[PDB]
């Protein structure tokens, strides 16, 4: 033992070692408060947390317009009970709603013999319909009814007197919300007399029963001033149009479409879709379908899709078919009219396995859409880029920022990304990670470099870069 | 009898690993269905382990567990090797992590949805420690009572989360998430599965270095392993039922995202939410750092009396005894882990060398059954039941070479630096006589510095 003992120690340690052990201990507690109040400074100098902006259910994912039930399932199971079996597919797409209908009773073109309370027995009963709601709400897939009255003829709103047409719709809002539907959709309100007046009543009826219930209105318009007139007194109204239906195919023009639609509304919640009922393929060539999709999933708003827009359902590539309502192509036995007219890379079941297929692009975005707190409710800032580019940044406070670069031109271009106006929170690094690319043939994960960034003809990029300063 | 014997067995465990790990096992297993299997494999694997230290503790039974048993089998540089590891890898990093979770459960309720700045969650983990040794450097009769209140607040927060989780199924949306999505998937079986187990076994730590004391107080002689099968799955049951309270009320994305899983469960249920969930868990983590400083005194008395650990360590103050130079050396080596980066980089760094040292004592237990029988073992275990432990245990070590050798590499640097000072420590030829004056000069300098006298001799 190297011990100096206990009784012999008390003689050696006393003299002036009482003071310098009383004073050595005081430097501890003055060194503790210099670490106590040195940690109160950093928590006060630390900025804030931005509060979450009270999202409803239609803010957190896409929608899925299902127009014609007899063509969605097919022949034999075109009914409401057959719809109850497809929900395990729609949840794989992670849609948060279904625009369902119209399923009410329309004889043909009669104001007198069209009822909005009673469904058509081509489909089923309310007991089929009550089972459909309760089965879907187990999976948290909400159901929105389509209440366009004359859904079989020329004029959808019955060109004769209009208040009784409105009085049916005034009363059917009250009835079906008792049944448990979570919103409504009327369409073609360019054929409505004084259209912007009846919606604000129907908005107030829908808000007059709850506040998790929405209303969607359709139109065939593409003019900006025609749209904003319908959104004058209304603010919590979703409005699908054909504002993006014009082809353009140039990035500086599509940038002029979107940013003016945001600047006119300010910052309100949009609903990005090309058309009110039609598919994406009706307006686009097949090499742009992987390119509008990503843009639809990244722009601030609720993307609304029609059925078959995830598998690239074109009606023109399959003759002997109604353009208005196509035939869903689940597998090879989905088109019983002509044998052998369907290839293998053209079906749900065939594209459910390829990691490069167009349906595989859809589940990768609809995953990242309703999970990234940037993409849900982030602020939006597009900035200048090359001649055929549409480039923008979605960012919430300190979450994972994003960056989308799009190539609407058929020339292999470079980035040329200069920010020069983005705020202090949205300043860009030089190296930036990749998440995916539209055209295959990239290293999905390799941190790309923005000044050394080139593109292929018609290829879009979803980069992401973390919060830093 | 044993009904008071089970409760102190449960008291050693269920510290603060349960308030970290459900974001760690959920991160490395995908599904919440498979992540609950990990909490079932850890409960079984601790039954096998603690039942061997029930046996191995009662054969030799000198004092100072896991090191005297290392001594009585090896008794050389391997005994000093395990004292070198546990003083510099296991026991400091087992205390910095619990000190870090105390900091994040004060600052996360203040924000409430941002990442807490790392440079301000470290300087609260130091005040959780540097204040808490200064309690323990003062009187133990205060320090044992303060800890006695910190097993109530721990067990009250656990029992709250169960009934707050059980009613959520009963109120509405029974099995509201019910996900088993990566039950067939996200299982690399040599990668992400094992690092789920390094973390899932962190929440069960403590079955080894404290379970010795239960036996001699009730004098059950051989009735202790009857308690160890009754006690430990009941603890495993508690770790199951909190994960069900996390999975049903929260989602699989909120748990991946948050540093704090408990406060998201606290926000969902009520609006008080600042007197309950951070308070009753900020008192849980504040006791396990306190409960890890009583045991640091008991270890240096064992190491110094054999010749290791220079005698400045393990010396008591006269008035109000509290081994000052012991407790200073614990907190200094704990604060040097404030140069770390992230928690789960340290839990993977803790649990490598932890399950190495536990595997060495049981191999030493089983080589003491090949050679040297008739030592009057009072507990009969099966011939392959500790072997069933060891081949399961050595699996976890060797698969952590293919996965992250950046931590196992530098950890072998610090244990091959203990050898150098072994040969200068106890192998050394005492010839030069300047240092034998220099050691005596330094020892009287620190005793005059801290007012400590040797152990009663
Ligand atoms: C950090 C905490 C400070 C407060 C507590 C004071 C503790 C002082 C010692 C700290 C280290 C204690 C463990 C030492 C390792 C075990 C050795 C052993 O068991 O010996 C028994 C042996 C027997 O002691 P006895 O039983 O009392 O006779 O004690 C010694 O030999 C003391 C030897 C001290 C030096 C150890 C070797 C150091 C070599 C490298 C020196 C580098 C110095 C820095 C260079 C400049 C940098 C700027
Ligand atoms: C990042 C670092 C910042 C935070 C830590 C700063 C370092 C301070 C020391 C480490 C932590 C101290 C914990 C506080 C302990 C005091 C508790 C207490 O109140 O007890 C009353 C205790 C007894 O009171 P007394 O009746 O006055 O003796 O007071 C003391 O004995 C003095 C304690 C202060 C010691 C601090 C400095 C220690 C000097 C170490 C010199 C080692 C040189 C030789 C070995 C070197 C090997 C390399
Ligand atoms: C419903 O919209 C109207 C204006 O479009 C708002 O004001 C109501 O106007 C009608 C006139 O047709 C009155 O009969 C109502 O009494 C008015 N409502 C009042 C005074 O609360 C009205 O604010 C909207 N409803 C809600 C709930 O905001
Ligand atoms: C919406 O579709 C109609 C159908 O072609 C467009 O044309 C209008 O058709 C109705 C009767 O079918 C006429 O009374 C209108 O005069 C037509 N419009 C024009 C401008 O001639 C209609 O233009 C479309 N709406 C928009 C905004 O383009
Ligand atoms: C579009 O946003 C810009 C701000 O970025 C604003 O446009 C300004 O409009 C006024 C009046 O037309 C001009 O005097 C300014 O020079 C414009 N500024 C810029 C930068 O263009 C305005 O907020 C939005 N435009 C409109 C018509 O509301
Ligand atoms: C399924 O994939 C094959 C291979 O990519 C497609 O075959 C090519 O299609 C392009 C455009 O349709 C033609 O220009 C090529 O000549 C085709 N190659 C061969 C070898 O035939 C096929 O078209 C895809 N299926 C569909 C429906 O587009
Ligand atoms: N064994 C521990 C306890 O609670 O006692 C210590 C570290 C933190 C949690 C578990 C590991």
Swiss-Prot record, chain A:
Q: Which positions, given as ranges, span the membrane?
A: 24-44
Where found, per UniProt?
A: Apical cell membrane; Cell membrane; Cell junction; Lysosome membrane
Q: What is the effect of changing residue 204 to Q?
A: Impairs both the stability and the trafficking of SLC3A2 to the plasma membrane
Cross-link for Glycyl lysine isopeptide (Lys-Gly) (interchain with G-Cter in SUMO2), residue positions: 5
Keywords (A to Z) from UniProt? Acetylation, Amino-acid transport, Cell junction, Cell membrane, Disulfide bond, Glycoprotein, Host cell receptor for virus entry, Isopeptide bond, Lysosome, Membrane, Phosphoprotein, Receptor, Signal-anchor, Transmembrane, Transmembrane helix, Transport, Ubl conjugation
Extracellular topology: which positions?
45-469
Phenotypic consequence of residue 345 to Q: Impairs both the stability and the trafficking of SLC3A2 to the plasma membrane
Q: In which tissues is it expressed?
A: Expressed ubiquitously in all tissues tested with highest levels detected in kidney, placenta and testis and weakest level in thymus. During gestation, expression in the placenta was significantly stronger at full-term than at the mid-trimester stage. Expressed in HUVECS and at low levels in resting peripheral blood T-lymphocytes and quiescent fibroblasts. Also expressed in fetal liver and in the astrocytic process of primary astrocytic gliomas. Expressed in retinal endothelial cells and in the intestinal epithelial cell line C2BBe1.
GO CC terms of this entry: amino acid transport complex; anchoring junction; apical plasma membrane; apical pole of neuron; basal plasma membrane; basolateral plasma membrane; cell surface; extracellular exosome
Induction description: Expression is induced in resting peripheral blood T-lymphocytes following PHA stimulation. Expression increases at the time of maximal DNA synthesis, in fibroblasts stimulated to divide. Expression and the uptake of leucine is stimulated in mononuclear, cytotrophoblast-like choriocarcinoma cells by combined treatment with PMA and calcium ionophore. Up-regulated in response to hydrogen peroxide. Highly expressed in various cancer types. (Microbial infection) Up-regulated upon hepatitis C virus/HCV infection via NS3-A4 viral protein complex; the up-regulation is mediated by oxidative stress. Up-regulation of the complex formed by SLC3A2 and SLC7A5/LAT1 upon hepatitis C virus/HCV infection.
Q: What is the effect of changing residue 371 to E?
A: Strongly decreased leucine transport activity
Impact after mutating residue 49 to S:
Abolishes dimerization, leucine uptake and interaction with beta-1 integrins
User: What effect on the protein does mutating residue 270 to S have, as reported in its record?
Assistant: No effect on dimerization, leucine uptake or interaction with beta-1 integrins
Where does it primarily localize? membrane
**Glycosylation site positions:** 204, 220, 263, 345
Coiled coil located at which positions?
Answer: none
PTM per Swiss-Prot/TrEMBL: N-glycosylated; N-glycosylation is crucial for trafficking and stability of SLC3A2 to the plasma membrane. Phosphorylation on Ser-245; Ser-247 or Ser-249 and on Ser-366 or Ser-370 by ecto-protein kinases favors heterotypic cell-cell interactions.
Location of Phosphoserine modifications: 4, 245, 247, 249, 366, 370
Supply one GO molecular-function term: neutral L-amino acid transmembrane transporter activity
| Organism of this sequence | Homo sapiens
Swiss-Prot record, chain B:
Domain of life (superkingdom): Eukaryota
Give the main localization category. Answer: membrane
Mutating residue 208 to D leads to what result? Nearly abolishes leucine transport activity
Give the GO biological process terms. Answer: alanine transport; amino acid import across plasma membrane; amino acid transmembrane transport; cellular response to glucose starvation; cellular response to L-arginine; cellular response to lipopolysaccharide; isoleucine transport; L-histidine transport
The portions of this protein that span the membrane are: 1-20, 34-54, 77-97, 120-140, 143-164, 193-213, 227-247, 275-295, 320-340, 346-366, 381-401, 408-428
Q: What is the effect of changing residue 253 to K?
A: Decreased leucine transport activity
Location relative to the cell: Apical cell membrane; Cell membrane; Lysosome membrane
Q: This chain belongs to which protein, by name?
A: Large neutral amino acids transporter small subunit 1
The gene designation is SLC7A5
């Amino acid at each position: 033992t190297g011990l100096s003992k206990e009784e012999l120690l008390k003689v050696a340690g006393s003299p002036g070692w009482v003071r310098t052990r009383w004073a050595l201990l005081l430097l501890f507690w003055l060194g503790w408060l210099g670490m106590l109040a040195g940690a109160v400074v950093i928590i006060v100098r630390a900025p804030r947390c931005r509060e979450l902006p009270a999202q409803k259910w239609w803010h957190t994912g896409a929608l899925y317009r299902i127009g014609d039930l007899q063509a969605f399932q097919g022949h034999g199971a075109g009914n409401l009970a057959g719809l109850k079996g497809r929900l395990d597919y729609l949840s794989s797409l992670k849609v948060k709603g279904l625009v369902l209908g119209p399923i009410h009773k329309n004889q043909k073109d009669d104001v007198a013999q069209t009822d909005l309370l009673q469904i058509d027995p081509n489909f089923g009963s309310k007991e089929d319909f009550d089972s459909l709601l309760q089965s879907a709400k187990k999976k948290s897939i909400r159901v929105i009814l389509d209440l366009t009255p004359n859904y079989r003829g020329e004029n959808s709103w019955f060109s004769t007197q209009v208040d009784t047409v409105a009085t049916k719709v005034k009363d059917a809002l009250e009835f079906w919300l008792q049944a448990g539907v979570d919103g409504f959709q009327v369409r073609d309100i360019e054929n409505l007399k004084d259209a912007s007046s009846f919606l604000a009543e129907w908005q107030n009826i829908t808000k007059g029963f709850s506040e998790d219930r929405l209303l969607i209105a359709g139109t065939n318009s593409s003019d900006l001033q025609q749209i904003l007139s319908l959104l004058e007194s209304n603010k919590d109204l979703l409005l699908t149009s054909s504002y993006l239906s014009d082809s353009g195919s140039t990035g500086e023009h599509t940038k002029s479409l979107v940013t003016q639609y945001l600047n006119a509304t300010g910052n309100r919640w949009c609903s990005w879709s090309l058309s009110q009922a039609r598919l994406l393929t009706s307006f686009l060539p097949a090499q742009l379908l992987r390119l509008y999709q990503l843009m639809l999933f990244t722009l601030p708003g609720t993307p609304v899709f029609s059925y078959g827009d995830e598998i690239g359902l074109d009606a023109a590539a399959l003759p002997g078919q109604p353009m208005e309502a196509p035939v869903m192509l689940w597998d090879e036995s989905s088109f019983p009219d002509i044998p052998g007219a369907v290839s293998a890379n053209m079906t749900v079941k065939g594209q459910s396995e390829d990691p490069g297929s167009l349906l595989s692009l859809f589940r990768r975005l609809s995953d990242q859409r309703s999970k990234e707190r940037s993409l849900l409710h982030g602020d939006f800032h597009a900035f200048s880029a090359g001649p055929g580019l549409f480039s923008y940044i979605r960012h919430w406070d300190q979450n994972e920022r994003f960056l989308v670069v799009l190539n609407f031109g058929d020339v292999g271009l470079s980035a040329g990304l200069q920010a020069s106006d983005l705020p202090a929170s949205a300043s860009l690094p030089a190296k930036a990670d990749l998440l995916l690319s539209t055209q295959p043939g990239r290293e999905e994960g390799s941190p790309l470099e923005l000044e050394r960034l080139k593109l292929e003809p018609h290829e879009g990029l979803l980069l992401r870069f973390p919060y830093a300063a | 009898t044993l009904l008071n014997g089970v409760a102190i067995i449960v008291g050693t465990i269920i510290g603060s690993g349960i308030f970290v790990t459900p974001t760690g096992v959920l991160k490395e297993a995908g599904s919440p269905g498979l992540a609950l299997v990990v909490w079932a494999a850890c409960g079984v694997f601790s039954i096998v382990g603690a039942l061997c230290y029930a046996e191995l503790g009662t054969t030799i039974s000198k004092s100072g567990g896991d090191y005297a048993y290392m001594l009585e089998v090896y008794g050389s540089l391997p005994a000093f090797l395990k004292l070198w590891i546990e003083l510099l890898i296991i026991r400091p990093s087992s205390q910095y992590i619990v000190a870090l979770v105390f900091a994040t459960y004060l600052l996360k309720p203040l924000f409430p949805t941002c990442p807490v700045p790392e440079e301000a969650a470290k300087l609260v983990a130091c005040l959780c420690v540097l204040l808490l040794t200064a309690v323990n450097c003062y009187s133990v009769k205060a320090a044992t009572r303060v800890q006695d209140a910190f097993a109530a607040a721990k067990l009250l927060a656990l029992a709250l989360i169960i009934l707050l989780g059980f009613v959520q199924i009963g109120k509405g949306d029974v099995s509201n998430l019910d996900p088993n999505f990566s039950f067939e998937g996200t299982k690399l079986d040599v990668g992400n599965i094992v690092l789920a187990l390094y973390s899932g076994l962190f929440a069960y730590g403590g079955w080894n270095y404290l379970n010795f004391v239960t036996e001699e107080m009730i004098n059950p002689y051989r009735n202790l392993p009857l308690a160890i099968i009754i006690s430990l799955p009941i603890v495993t049951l508690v770790y199951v039922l909190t994960n069900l309270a996390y999975f049903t009320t929260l989602s699989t994305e909120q748990m991946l995202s948050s540093e704090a899983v408990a406060v998201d469960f606290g926000n969902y249920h009520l609006g008080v939410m600042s007197w309950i969930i951070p308070v009753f868990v900020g008192l849980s983590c504040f006791g396990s750092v306190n409960g890890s400083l009583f045991t640091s005194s008991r270890l240096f008395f064992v190491g110094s009396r054999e010749g290791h650990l220079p005698s400045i360590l393990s010396m008591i103050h006269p008035q109000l005894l509290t081994p000052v130079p012991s407790l200073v050396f614990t907190c200094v080596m704990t604060l040097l882990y404030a140069f770390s980066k992230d928690i789960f980089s340290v839990i993977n760094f803790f649990s490598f060398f932890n399950w190495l040292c536990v595997a060495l004592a049981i191999i030493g237990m089983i080589w003491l059954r090949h050679r040297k029988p008739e030592l009057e073992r009072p507990i009969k275990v099966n011939l392959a039941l500790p072997v069933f432990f060891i081949l399961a245990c050595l699996f976890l070590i060797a698969v952590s070479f293919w996965k992250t050798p950046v931590e196992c590499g530098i950890g072998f640097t610090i244990i091959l630096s203990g050898l150098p000072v072994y040969f200068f420590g106890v192998w050394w030829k005492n010839k030069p006589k300047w240092l034998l004056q220099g050691i005596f000069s330094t020892t009287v300098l620190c005793q005059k510095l801290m007012q400590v006298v040797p152990q009663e001799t």
